[PDB]
Write a protein that holds these residues in place. Sequence first.
Motif, mmCIF file in Angstrom:
data_model
loop_
_atom_site.group_PDB
_atom_site.id
_atom_site.type_symbol
_atom_site.label_atom_id
_atom_site.label_comp_id
_atom_site.label_asym_id
_atom_site.label_seq_id
_atom_site.Cartn_x
_atom_site.Cartn_y
_atom_site.Cartn_z
ATOM 1 N N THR A 1 -10.344 -11.903 21.981
ATOM 2 C CA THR A 1 -10.344 -10.969 20.857
ATOM 3 C C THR A 1 -11.264 -11.416 19.729
ATOM 4 O OG1 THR A 1 -8.571 -11.868 19.482
ATOM 5 C CG2 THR A 1 -7.939 -10.665 21.467
ATOM 6 N N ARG B 1 -8.363 -3.991 25.666
ATOM 7 C CA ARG B 1 -7.114 -3.938 24.921
ATOM 8 C C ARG B 1 -5.931 -4.136 25.849
ATOM 9 N NH1 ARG B 1 -4.402 -0.739 22.417
ATOM 10 N NH2 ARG B 1 -5.346 1.311 22.798
ATOM 11 N N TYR C 1 -3.558 -7.691 26.658
ATOM 12 C CA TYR C 1 -2.110 -7.530 26.650
ATOM 13 C C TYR C 1 -1.498 -8.173 27.882
ATOM 14 C CZ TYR C 1 -2.492 -3.956 22.961
ATOM 15 O OH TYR C 1 -2.742 -3.282 21.793
ATOM 16 N N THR D 1 6.500 -8.937 24.244
ATOM 17 C CA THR D 1 6.212 -7.511 24.363
ATOM 18 C C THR D 1 6.438 -6.750 23.067
ATOM 19 O OG1 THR D 1 8.372 -6.596 24.951
ATOM 20 C CG2 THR D 1 7.165 -7.793 26.653
ATOM 21 N N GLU D 2 7.307 -7.256 22.188
ATOM 22 C CA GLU D 2 7.387 -6.752 20.821
ATOM 23 C C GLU D 2 6.053 -6.903 20.102
ATOM 24 O OE1 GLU D 2 7.728 -7.651 17.154
ATOM 25 O OE2 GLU D 2 7.822 -5.477 17.446
ATOM 26 N N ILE E 1 3.271 -6.854 21.748
ATOM 27 C CA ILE E 1 2.338 -6.018 22.499
ATOM 28 C C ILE E 1 2.477 -4.558 22.090
ATOM 29 C CG2 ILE E 1 1.731 -5.211 24.794
ATOM 30 C CD1 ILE E 1 2.427 -7.910 25.846
ATOM 31 N N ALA F 1 3.719 -3.266 19.470
ATOM 32 C CA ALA F 1 3.346 -3.017 18.085
ATOM 33 C C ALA F 1 1.839 -2.882 17.938
ATOM 34 C CB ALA F 1 3.868 -4.138 17.198
ATOM 35 N N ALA F 2 1.077 -3.720 18.641
ATOM 36 C CA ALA F 2 -0.374 -3.626 18.596
ATOM 37 C C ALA F 2 -0.908 -2.453 19.399
ATOM 38 C CB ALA F 2 -1.001 -4.922 19.109
ATOM 39 N N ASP F 3 -0.078 -1.840 20.241
ATOM 40 C CA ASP F 3 -0.538 -0.713 21.041
ATOM 41 C C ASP F 3 -0.604 0.560 20.213
ATOM 42 O OD1 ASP F 3 -1.371 0.751 23.220
ATOM 43 O OD2 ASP F 3 0.214 -0.002 24.532
ATOM 44 N N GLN G 1 -1.027 0.886 16.988
ATOM 45 C CA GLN G 1 -2.170 0.837 16.091
ATOM 46 C C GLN G 1 -3.492 0.908 16.837
ATOM 47 O OE1 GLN G 1 -1.118 -3.017 14.335
ATOM 48 N NE2 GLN G 1 0.016 -1.902 12.756
ATOM 49 N N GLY G 2 -3.484 0.681 18.148
ATOM 50 C CA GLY G 2 -4.699 0.786 18.930
ATOM 51 C C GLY G 2 -5.702 -0.311 18.687
ATOM 52 N N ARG G 3 -5.246 -1.517 18.390
ATOM 53 C CA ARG G 3 -6.125 -2.614 18.025
ATOM 54 C C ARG G 3 -5.844 -3.828 18.900
ATOM 55 N NH1 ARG G 3 -4.859 -2.944 12.007
ATOM 56 N NH2 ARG G 3 -6.890 -4.002 12.137
ATOM 57 N N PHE G 4 -6.722 -4.818 18.788
ATOM 58 C CA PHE G 4 -6.642 -6.008 19.615
ATOM 59 C C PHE G 4 -5.506 -6.911 19.153
ATOM 60 C CE2 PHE G 4 -10.917 -4.826 20.841
ATOM 61 C CZ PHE G 4 -10.946 -5.201 22.169
ATOM 62 N N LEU G 5 -5.213 -7.914 19.971
ATOM 63 C CA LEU G 5 -4.195 -8.898 19.630
ATOM 64 C C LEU G 5 -4.765 -9.846 18.593
ATOM 65 C CD1 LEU G 5 -2.428 -9.651 22.991
ATOM 66 C CD2 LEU G 5 -1.581 -8.405 21.018
ATOM 67 N N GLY G 6 -4.508 -9.558 17.325
ATOM 68 C CA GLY G 6 -4.912 -10.441 16.261
ATOM 69 C C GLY G 6 -4.000 -11.646 16.154
ATOM 70 N N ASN G 7 -4.160 -12.365 15.048
ATOM 71 C CA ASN G 7 -3.320 -13.529 14.815
ATOM 72 C C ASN G 7 -1.921 -13.140 14.362
ATOM 73 O OD1 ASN G 7 -2.784 -16.269 14.750
ATOM 74 N ND2 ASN G 7 -4.698 -16.738 13.690
ATOM 75 N N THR G 8 -1.725 -11.885 13.953
ATOM 76 C CA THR G 8 -0.387 -11.403 13.627
ATOM 77 C C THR G 8 0.502 -11.353 14.859
ATOM 78 O OG1 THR G 8 -1.829 -9.562 13.023
ATOM 79 C CG2 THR G 8 0.016 -10.061 11.572
ATOM 80 N N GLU G 9 -0.007 -10.802 15.958
ATOM 81 C CA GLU G 9 0.807 -10.690 17.157
ATOM 82 C C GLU G 9 0.838 -12.003 17.917
ATOM 83 O OE1 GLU G 9 -1.954 -8.606 16.734
ATOM 84 O OE2 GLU G 9 -0.857 -6.975 15.754
ATOM 85 N N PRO H 1 3.431 -11.399 10.145
ATOM 86 C CA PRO H 1 4.361 -11.461 11.286
ATOM 87 C C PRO H 1 5.812 -11.706 10.896
ATOM 88 C CG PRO H 1 3.056 -13.430 11.197
ATOM 89 C CD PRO H 1 2.471 -12.512 10.176
ATOM 90 N N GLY I 1 -1.537 -13.628 8.548
ATOM 91 C CA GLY I 1 -1.849 -12.470 9.359
ATOM 92 C C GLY I 1 -3.154 -11.838 8.915
ATOM 93 N N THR I 2 -3.516 -10.764 9.610
ATOM 94 C CA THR I 2 -4.703 -10.008 9.244
ATOM 95 C C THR I 2 -4.402 -8.881 8.272
ATOM 96 O OG1 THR I 2 -4.676 -8.257 10.912
ATOM 97 C CG2 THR I 2 -5.370 -10.451 11.615
ATOM 98 N N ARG J 1 -2.078 8.211 13.280
ATOM 99 C CA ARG J 1 -2.390 8.021 14.696
ATOM 100 C C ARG J 1 -1.316 8.606 15.594
ATOM 101 N NH1 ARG J 1 -3.013 1.939 12.891
ATOM 102 N NH2 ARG J 1 -5.275 1.747 12.562
ATOM 103 N N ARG K 1 -2.322 11.579 18.263
ATOM 104 C CA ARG K 1 -2.206 11.231 19.675
ATOM 105 C C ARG K 1 -1.382 12.262 20.427
ATOM 106 N NH1 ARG K 1 -1.425 4.922 21.493
ATOM 107 N NH2 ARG K 1 -3.642 4.349 21.393
#
Lengths: 172, 172, 172, 162, 162, 162, 162, 284
Positions: free
Chosen positions: B45, B91, B95, D6-7, D9, D11-13, D15-23, F4, F103-104, H35, H39
């Motif tokens: 990422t 993405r 995951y 997966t919580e 995962i 959550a980041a789904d 928002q449609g964004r990559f796995l940042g340092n938050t997740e 987080p 976090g971000t 979103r 969607r």
Amino acid sequence: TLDVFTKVVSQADSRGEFLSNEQLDALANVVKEGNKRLDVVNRITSNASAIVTNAARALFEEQPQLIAPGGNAYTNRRMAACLRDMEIILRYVTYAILAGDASVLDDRCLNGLRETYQALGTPGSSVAVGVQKMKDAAVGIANDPNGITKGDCSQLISEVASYFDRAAAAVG
Amino acid sequence: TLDVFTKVVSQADSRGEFLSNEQLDALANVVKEGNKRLDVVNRITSNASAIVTNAARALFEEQPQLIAPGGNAYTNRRMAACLRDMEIILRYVTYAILAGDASVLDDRCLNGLRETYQALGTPGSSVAVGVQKMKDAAVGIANDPNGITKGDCSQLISEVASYFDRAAAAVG
Amino acid sequence: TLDVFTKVVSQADSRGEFLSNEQLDALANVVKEGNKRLDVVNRITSNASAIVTNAARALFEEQPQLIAPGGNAYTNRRMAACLRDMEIILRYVTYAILAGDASVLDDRCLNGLRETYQALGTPGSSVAVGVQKMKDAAVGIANDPNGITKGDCSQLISEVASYFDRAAAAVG
Amino acid sequence: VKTPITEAIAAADTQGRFLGNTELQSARGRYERAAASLEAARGLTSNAQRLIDGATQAVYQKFPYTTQTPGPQFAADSRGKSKCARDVGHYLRIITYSLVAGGTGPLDEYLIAGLAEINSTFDLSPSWYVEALKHIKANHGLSGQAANEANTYIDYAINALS
Amino acid sequence: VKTPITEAIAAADTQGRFLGNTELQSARGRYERAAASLEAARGLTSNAQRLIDGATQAVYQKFPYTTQTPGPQFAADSRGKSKCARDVGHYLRIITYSLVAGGTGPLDEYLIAGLAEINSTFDLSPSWYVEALKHIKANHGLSGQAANEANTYIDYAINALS
Amino acid sequence: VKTPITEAIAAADTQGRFLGNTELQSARGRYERAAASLEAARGLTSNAQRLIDGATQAVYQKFPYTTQTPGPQFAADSRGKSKCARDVGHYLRIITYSLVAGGTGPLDEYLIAGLAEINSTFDLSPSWYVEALKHIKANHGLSGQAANEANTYIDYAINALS
Amino acid sequence: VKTPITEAIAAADTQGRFLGNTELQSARGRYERAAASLEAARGLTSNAQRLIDGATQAVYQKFPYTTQTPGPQFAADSRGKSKCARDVGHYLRIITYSLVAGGTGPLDEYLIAGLAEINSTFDLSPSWYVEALKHIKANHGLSGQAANEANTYIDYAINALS
Amino acid sequence: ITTAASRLGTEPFSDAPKVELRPKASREEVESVIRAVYRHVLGNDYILASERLVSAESLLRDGNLTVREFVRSVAKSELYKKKFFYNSFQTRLIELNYKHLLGRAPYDESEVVYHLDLYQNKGYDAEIDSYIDSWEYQSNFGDNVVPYYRGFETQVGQKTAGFNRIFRLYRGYANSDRAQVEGTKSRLARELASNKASTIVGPSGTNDSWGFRASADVAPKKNLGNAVGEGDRVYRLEVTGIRSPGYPSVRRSSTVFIVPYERLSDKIQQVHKQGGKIVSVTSA
Ligand SMILES: *[C@H](C)[C@H]1/C(=C/c2[nH]c(/C=C3N=C(/C=C4\NC(=O)C(CC)=C4C)C(C)=C\3CCC(=O)O)c(CCC(=O)O)c2C)NC(=O)[C@@H]1C
Ligand SMILES: *[C@H](C)[C@H]1/C(=C/c2[nH]c(/C=C3N=C(/C=C4\NC(=O)C(CC)=C4C)C(C)=C\3CCC(=O)O)c(CCC(=O)O)c2C)NC(=O)[C@@H]1C
Ligand SMILES: CCC1=C(C)/C(=C/C2=NC(=C\c3[nH]c(/C=C4\NC(=O)[C@H](C)[C@H]4CC)c(C)c3CCC(=O)O)/C(CCC(=O)O)=C2C)NC1=O
Ligand SMILES: CCC1=C(C)/C(=C/C2=NC(=C\c3[nH]c(/C=C4\NC(=O)[C@H](C)[C@H]4CC)c(C)c3CCC(=O)O)/C(CCC(=O)O)=C2C)NC1=O
Ligand SMILES: CCC1=C(C)/C(=C/C2=NC(=C\c3[nH]c(/C=C4\NC(=O)[C@H](C)[C@H]4CC)c(C)c3CCC(=O)O)/C(CCC(=O)O)=C2C)NC1=O
Ligand SMILES: CCC1=C(C)/C(=C/C2=NC(=C\c3[nH]c(/C=C4\NC(=O)[C@H](C)[C@H]4CC)c(C)c3CCC(=O)O)/C(CCC(=O)O)=C2C)NC1=O
Ligand SMILES: CCC1=C(C)/C(=C/C2=NC(=C\c3[nH]c(/C=C4\NC(=O)[C@H](C)[C@H]4CC)c(C)c3CCC(=O)O)/C(CCC(=O)O)=C2C)NC1=O
Ligand SMILES: CCC1=C(C)/C(=C/C2=NC(=C\c3[nH]c(/C=C4\NC(=O)[C@H](C)[C@H]4CC)c(C)c3CCC(=O)O)/C(CCC(=O)O)=C2C)NC1=O
Ligand SMILES: CCC1=C(C)/C(=C/C2=NC(=C\c3[nH]c(/C=C4\NC(=O)[C@H](C)[C@H]4CC)c(C)c3CCC(=O)O)/C(CCC(=O)O)=C2C)NC1=O
Ligand SMILES: CCC1=C(C)/C(=C/C2=NC(=C\c3[nH]c(/C=C4\NC(=O)[C@H](C)[C@H]4CC)c(C)c3CCC(=O)O)/C(CCC(=O)O)=C2C)NC1=O
Ligand SMILES: CCC1=C(C)/C(=C/C2=NC(=C\c3[nH]c(/C=C4\NC(=O)[C@H](C)[C@H]4CC)c(C)c3CCC(=O)O)/C(CCC(=O)O)=C2C)NC1=O
Ligand SMILES: CCC1=C(C)/C(=C/C2=NC(=C\c3[nH]c(/C=C4\NC(=O)[C@H](C)[C@H]4CC)c(C)c3CCC(=O)O)/C(CCC(=O)O)=C2C)NC1=O
């Protein structure tokens, strides 16, 4: 929803070349016949409701079993819906005359009419007669000169007779 | 959305017995390799947008007919459709790497991609080449040691090469 | 939704300067007391439903006119709703304990409770009394050592007694 | 199911964004928690036959009428007591499932969803299994940090019964 | 696509009514505008090889670093300059498309939708094509009323870049 | 903002349930990460005047035309170079903000929201700040595991620029 | 109200974009149409007292029972005939309104909305005003291209009655 | 639905949190509500930045606007019509607005009849006002709650024929609903007035064969003939894609077979030799 212009545009987009000179010569002719196109489209919507009732009586005489009980257009509701619909052919035909293309006619009023009747039980053939009774009166309304300047539009009126024949043959 | 842990849980639920000792011995190993899993996921990422553009140029060179007119990715809009999408493989791949299981990859990014293209006209080869050009660069980004402690993760990197190969072969 | 960290961040953003050294010294102390914060928050949600029923009986004894007919909490429905409301205090209190800040408590569970009762007829004072009866039992649940290591958290438990007193005094 | 991997995962789904340092920080919180939770599951799986024998006898001594009253719902006949050890034998699986998964996912998906829905119909009093779990809470024999981890899921099931 | 003929059509479709005189007057506004716009398209198609040669050389003299800096995005190599005349050769098609269609339909559907979306990714600065179009705006050579019609679509593309 | 801790809060809010062990394990993942991240913020705050001097001079040597070309957008005049150290001086605050917050969140709320929106208008090329951050990525002088964690927020800002 | 100027405005509002050349060409179609439509309105305003006298007497000779039948709805009494010239005097205003506005806006907003709704209640047959307008259609005395413009709004009202 | 949700691809909707709009304003939660609207309403199509409707958003930040008035304003917008309304049939749209604005597939054909006479008399812009101002919308979606799919659970009062019309509507999370191979035409206009409920076909990879639509003149679902078999058990097996020997042997792929019991075991062995895939057998 396509034009005569965007017909040439989407065709010239697929080849990926510039617009040729004779295509601009042909579209310049559509500008010259553009005022006759507003002559024919304005004459139909002024006589819209008069040609729905007049084509309905000629249909329901010559097939009397429809109104008759047991028929598909017997009760006042179905009859109201069928009568209301005959505008919807004319709504999408006069769209296509002013567009000059049959793309708007195809994906709204033609794409599922021969589909929707097997589940509905309405006869496809009867509907075609109804639209073919519109065509000889819609051409005859735009043909006669009364208080307009005389011109020639036989190359343009044949497009209107093609549009009803496209609408008729796609169902029956 | 399943884990490696809930993979064992839902499998042990179907037999209806307690969790066996070697299954807890295997999951204790996943705890020990858990910090290497965050090493590999954080490296992708960070290089996410750099590997989308770099795999796009290698795709659109070697199939030049796509951005050529008439191609499926010709106009700016669809072109962004493809460009935006190549992240959506990444993405759902990263995951699945952090999940350690291919269940999240399957029901979101794999369940209808080979479905949606027959109605869309997007060719199969373009997608396969595009994701297989990500795989040799995504493995190569996580392989090289620069400023990290040296370890062995060949048994873990092969899971990542399996995930792209799962994503590639389900479409083309 | 704010933290103790983002409290310092949004305060340091307004001055527009870098984060000072003693602020990082203070936040390093919050890291050291971070494990005691999970000790106190986990103890409340384990005893969540036991402290709702126990504070309800002590409320409905000492104000008997509520259950009694004509009261605001007489019928089973309103009574069910009132029971739910008590948890919703505890839902937003233990959010604020784990956050370490009263921003989440303020804009969800505090921003319209003293508002919504004039239109509802519920007694504000009675509700406040019920909330207080939670506070002396929630502090007493987290106070006693049984099977945990002994530590000192009187500077942290006073934050919890401040959170209920913030929730109580904003309504009654 | 719900897992703090997966919580992060799901959550980041949305928002449609990559796995940042938050997740990403939610993952290692699950990882080092397992080492105090996997031998918390080993304390229950080794003592499997002790606790389902212990909790079932603890229910009968707490409620002495449930062995005498005639009814299918009760434990007067033999097939009631055969269904007794099945039920508490089914509770200890999910607690070992939710300890190993590290979240309340299997407790949500397999036990407490519709648990208050069925007990109104079959007139099974939930206070029966409250005293059943409270015997397991006191007699599990687990100690230390691992014991604390096995203690919450017992209390999370009790609040779902009530 | 968007055309003031079809703009009159799609507006009358949502109301579910016939083509009244409201939608009809939008047609002849498109018709007599074409006679000042079709020879505005003939001025560009006849001068096709002049302008894409002119605008490409105007970009290099405005930004002298774009011929020297090493990168795929730039025009240092030959295939960059081969992709240079492709891009501005692609702009002049849509301007001749949107002049002939008489609306901003083809500019919407084929050029500017996602145009700010791709330029963030491939780091193509939009100010490159701003100076490219401004050379075409001054050196098209069109004159009179027809020139004014060809002048708006150039300026409509510039505001879409910025 | 996104943290987080608050990621665990807002997820448990929509389900309307208490803070179970699913949301609780996300907290200690943030907590022990701070001890490798707070002295990662101390390495940047102590070296504040070094990096904004270093990255600004690195931009001019990478793009030599940005000191010579006449325009407000460029750094030809003095107030351009005064706005130069303001901009990269504004980047290093949010990186120290997002390292401390863990976090971000502050990178989302304060920097990259609408960052691709303004750069189309003021024709500020994002590749300017790409090379600015890449100088900070190589010359921040931090070492160890803690240094690596900070390294992500620099790379998370770069992917947001592109 | 509906006007092909405002038809161009409300269409560009929902897309949230500026007035391009698509909406702009709809304006001059309204403008040069007014010069054949404003003296089409001058032919009706000068002949105001002729037509409302002519159409009212044309209704009585077409339907001879409407002067004899006793009822409020009919024109047996004097008030009825006083309400007769009010109604057709109200039709000629909106036709002159919709000719001057250049669209079917005032015909929509002021006449035909709920026109089939009231005539069921007050048992006013719409075929009364059909023959009333058809007398105005033949006896308005207007000629040429401008006359055609005044002829559509008469026919647009007739199709709304039926 | 779990272990059917993995196959049908409805596991993300089965555990999907309601977004809401708590009345305190925050940019992130508002950003994640937006979103969630685009969607579901646009069927996982993408919105580019010119396509963003940024002027729609400014009103949303203020307290007065409610997701409900916002969902009225996205569907009346000409963006949404450019993808769905212009390139489609009117019955398809009546079928389609129940999928987005209400979330369920159409129950009866009579619900459909009401819309057409409303659409003619009051226009399309008043038709979408009648989808939003319905009691079924207000009961399950508040003013500050996004429309989600309600096709799966009970939503008491549903008919089960509408449980399977929802699986004819979208083929997975991944799909556009402009990207199904019958894209323009109404997939359920035949089913609504024949009043039969066709077979649930799930999406790709989880199900080996996604390629089954109901034909025009296909075999009846319940039959009368004993079909040579000595014992009456008769089963109705359909095949999806047959690429066995050519021009005379296969005149029609995807044909529905009705085979009785005792030769069913050999029948599955003939279909696999033809290279066909079976979506359903059904006792009748
Ligand atoms: C008329 C000459 C014949 C006829 C008409 C008739 N049709 C129906 C029922 C329907 N008609 C349609 C038609 C359309 N739907 C569209 O979306 C469009 C394009 C915009 C068209 C043309 C549809 C979908 C139906 C189904 C029900 C509906 O109204 O929504 C009826 C009623 C029949 C019934 O109720 O069973 C009638 C009377 N039928 C005849 O008898 C004439 C031969
Ligand atoms: C041609 C422009 C496009 C195309 C066609 C294509 N068709 C097949 C295979 C078949 N085609 C038919 C068609 C019919 N059978 C009938 O009885 C009738 C009614 C008169 C029709 C129209 C059938 C039954 C088949 C089965 C296969 C066979 O050939 O026996 C293929 C081959 C598919 C395969 O998997 O081998 C193709 C390619 N494909 C295109 O790409 C063109 C645009
Ligand atoms: C099953 C219930 C049912 C009824 C009752 C019904 C009536 C009905 N009568 C009609 C016409 C008609 N109705 C009448 C009847 C009358 N007009 C007069 O002059 C007299 C006063 C009056 C009879 C006492 C006439 C003469 C027509 C033909 C009018 C025309 O063609 O314009 C029409 C429109 C054309 C048609 O299909 O024939 C309907 C729908 N339809 C229904 O579905
Ligand atoms: C949108 C509003 C609008 C309308 C309605 C319109 C119509 C229109 N029709 C015209 C001409 C004409 N229109 C017709 C039409 C016909 N003659 C026949 O005998 C045929 C039966 C019939 C076609 C079926 C003809 C023949 C002319 C001659 C002039 C020309 O070629 O334009 C002209 C030329 C200019 C003028 O008359 O002043 C106008 C204005 N112009 C407008 O701006
Ligand atoms: C190129 C192949 C390769 C990989 C992948 C690799 C990773 C790697 N990551 C390590 C450590 C680590 N990696 C992480 C990473 C993280 N922890 C968190 O909680 C964060 C969310 C996350 C960063 C975002 C941590 C915290 C450690 C602890 C040990 C150390 O500081 O190295 C170590 C130390 C030695 C060991 O684990 O045996 C290895 C091997 N080494 C290799 O040779
Ligand atoms: C107007 C309709 C209506 C009814 C009927 C009603 C019942 C009701 N009974 C309650 C408690 C109670 N209900 C009972 C009754 C019984 N327990 C026993 O042991 C016996 C078997 C049984 C009586 C035959 C008792 C003793 C309590 C107090 C229990 C407690 O405080 O925990 C409670 C909760 C506390 C309360 O306010 O007093 C409600 C809401 N509420 C309503 O609004
Ligand atoms: C998460 C923050 C939050 C809270 C707390 C909240 C409360 C809330 N309480 C309500 C009603 C109520 N709440 C009560 C509460 C009580 N009655 C008493 O006498 C006691 C003092 C007290 C219980 C301890 C009662 C009786 C009603 C209903 C009153 C009526 O409808 O007439 C309602 C009305 C509609 C509904 O419940 O669905 C809301 C929205 N909403 C929120 O979003
Ligand atoms: C009665 C007053 C009182 C409290 C509140 C208390 C709590 C407390 N919790 C501790 C440890 C701890 N507490 C936790 C708790 C958790 N960590 C997680 O990540 C989980 C989510 C959560 C359990 C659900 C952990 C993991 C430790 C580590 C040290 C230990 O094992 O004790 C310790 C060890 C000594 C210290 O921290 O100084 C204290 C003091 N001690 C007291 O005297
Ligand atoms: C996988 C997790 C899981 C559990 C644990 C579970 C329990 C469960 N136990 C039930 C009945 C029962 N449960 C018991 C158990 C007991 N009754 C007693 O008398 C004893 C006190 C006690 C055992 C210690 C008995 C005897 C029945 C049958 C009662 C009846 O048929 O009415 C029922 C309703 C009928 C059934 O299908 O058998 C459920 C759903 N279901 C689940 O899905
Ligand atoms: C039909 C409308 C249309 C246009 C105009 C369009 C442009 C376009 N130009 C591109 C690249 C490019 N564009 C250019 C053009 C330039 N770079 C320079 O250095 C010069 C300043 C400038 C020309 C004056 C170059 C050299 C590339 C290749 C850059 C790379 O590969 O990274 C790309 C990305 C890669 C590609 O497929 O080739 C697109 C999508 N796409 C479209 O669909
Ligand atoms: C601005 C457009 C406009 C029109 C045209 C209009 C007509 C209109 N005419 C009405 C009544 C009437 N309309 C008429 C007209 C007629 N009845 C006959 O007998 C004759 C056949 C026919 C005239 C040729 C009469 C006599 C009344 C009074 C009927 C009554 O009072 O019951 C009424 C109901 C009562 C009223 O306010 O006076 C309306 C609303 N309203 C409008 O807003
Ligand atoms: C994360 C789960 C997920 C996936 C996988 C997904 C994919 C996806 N790709 C789509 C379109 C598309 N996908 C592509 C992809 C390509 N075309 C080519 O020719 C190239 C070879 C290739 C890129 C390398 C294109 C070009 C479109 C747009 C097609 C069009 O606009 O006609 C669509 C239709 C909706 C839309 O385009 O707005 C979807 C749903 N959507 C999702 O939600």
